Structure 1
Amino acid sequence: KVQLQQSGAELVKPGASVKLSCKASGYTFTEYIIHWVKQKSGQGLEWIGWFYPGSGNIKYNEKFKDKATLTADKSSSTVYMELSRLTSEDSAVYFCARHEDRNYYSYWDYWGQGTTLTVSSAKTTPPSVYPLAPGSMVTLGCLVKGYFPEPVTVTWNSGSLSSGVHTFPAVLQSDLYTLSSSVTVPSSTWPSETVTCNVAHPASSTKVDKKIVPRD
């Protein structure tokens, strides 16, 4: 089956370079053209350029002419995009897309997920996880404050509580991210049984479990 797989999220200091990769598999590499698209979080899509393996033909969106370099390995069926002299407005989610070489009656039929590049001088910071207990249907939650790199992972009881959960998008309080999550469960369920929100901030490799306890 056709699958395009891209490198994981990145965090680089301004000025340095980054090499984003798009790995193809399940189809002949030298028959389709790989496009690259940038989507600044929130805003709309923007094209950067295409690359055709085989001929090695490139054609940059002429805005990103000095920003981006398109190369390819071909032995691993992998297209590369390097961005150099990074600044704050390069922080965006970057897609790769596939299109047939000689068609016209085709479209960008397969995409390869996002890669969220973050350009900042902020230091990588683990999160502080605080439980939130109240004081017929009982709402709980935990607060995840004071982390930077992004993203984080919040489950409840290792994923045993799925429905009735609301994990909210992060925001920058100063120059650190803050996130909140909630779970609502029957009064018969809690505090008579354990409730433990599970947080994971992979950029610092932390993995935290906080039991929600009623107050005194």
Structure 2
Amino acid sequence: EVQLQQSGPELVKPGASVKMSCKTSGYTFTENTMHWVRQSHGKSLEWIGGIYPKNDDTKYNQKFKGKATLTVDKSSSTACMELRSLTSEDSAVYYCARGDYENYFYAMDYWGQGTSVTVSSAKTTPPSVYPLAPGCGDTTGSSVTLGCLVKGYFPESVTVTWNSGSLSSSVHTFPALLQSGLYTMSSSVTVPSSTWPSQTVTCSVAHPASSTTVDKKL
């Protein structure tokens, strides 16, 4: 069984470098080659480069000639990749894949864990969430929805719960966007109008990075 294990994501200051290494197992390393693929946002794929550790010889993309640097260690059967001069748009997902037998063709069967990189100049901020509830005095229609806006939090992501996890049916998880160096997301739940506003409801969010939890009444 061929298995390639990667490392964990890291936080890099723009302008510094990064060390990416993923070990290989389940086969013989030096007879085959290695490749790298970058997945840019939102959805795209691009071939970073490859290394065949018999010489060692390599080939890179025309744009990565002055950035990506690859090296290999055959003692621990691992493959390394170095990236320098990181910019704001350099945040992406990298893969560890094994190529053909002394060949770069013959499309690769197995891929990496998908370890990504995070490069930004902004520090961690506690999430600021506020209750949003009706209203002008009437609720239309018979099925009314609620929600709470989670904004001003770093980094992705935050964990949100509804009524201490009592109702898991109507919970909806909305992704965020990138503006002003911060992140803004939301969530939506639907409750019948018969129980509103008789039964209590709340919005609870937890941020694992800064260990900040905020409880509030809608």
TM-score using structure 2 length: 0.75
Name the counterpart of 1:192.
199
Q: Which moved more, 1:104-113 or 1:81-90?
A: 104-113
Contact 1:11–1:149 (Cα < 8 Å) also in 2: no
Identity %: 71
Once the two structures are superposed, the pairs formed by residues 123-202 of structure 1 within 5 Å of their partners are: 123-135=123-135, 136-156=142-162, 161-186=167-192, 192=199, 197-202=204-209
Aligned counterparts of 1:154 and 1:53: Cα–Cα separation in 2: 47
Displacement after TM superposition at 1:49 (Å) = 0.7
Q: Which runs of 5+ in 1 are unaligned?
A: none
The amino acid of 1:199's aligned partner reads A
Q: Say which SS state the counterpart of residue 114 (structure 2) adopts.
A: coil
Deviations 1:174-200 (A, max 9, x none): 221111122334567776366554433
Greater gyration radius: 2
SS of match in other structure, 1:116: coil
Alignment gaps of 5+ in structure 2: 136-141
3-state SS of 1:89 partner:
helix
Q: Is the 8 Å Cα contact of residues 127 and 201 (structure 1) preserved in structure 2?
A: no
**What's the offset of the Cα at 1:37?**
1.1
Is the alpha carbon distance of 1:131 and 1:32 closer, same or farther for their aligned partners in structure 2, counting shifts above 3 Å? farther
Q: For 1:36, what is the secondary structure of its paired residue?
A: strand
Amino acid in the other structure paired with 1:210 = D
Provide the aligned C-alpha RMSD in A.
3.3
Structure 1 CA distance for aligned equivalents of residues 165 and 81 of structure 2: 36
Q: Could you state the TM-score of these two structures normalised by the residue count of structure 1?
A: 0.76
Alignment of 1:32-51 (within 5 A): 32-51=32-51
Higher strand share: 1
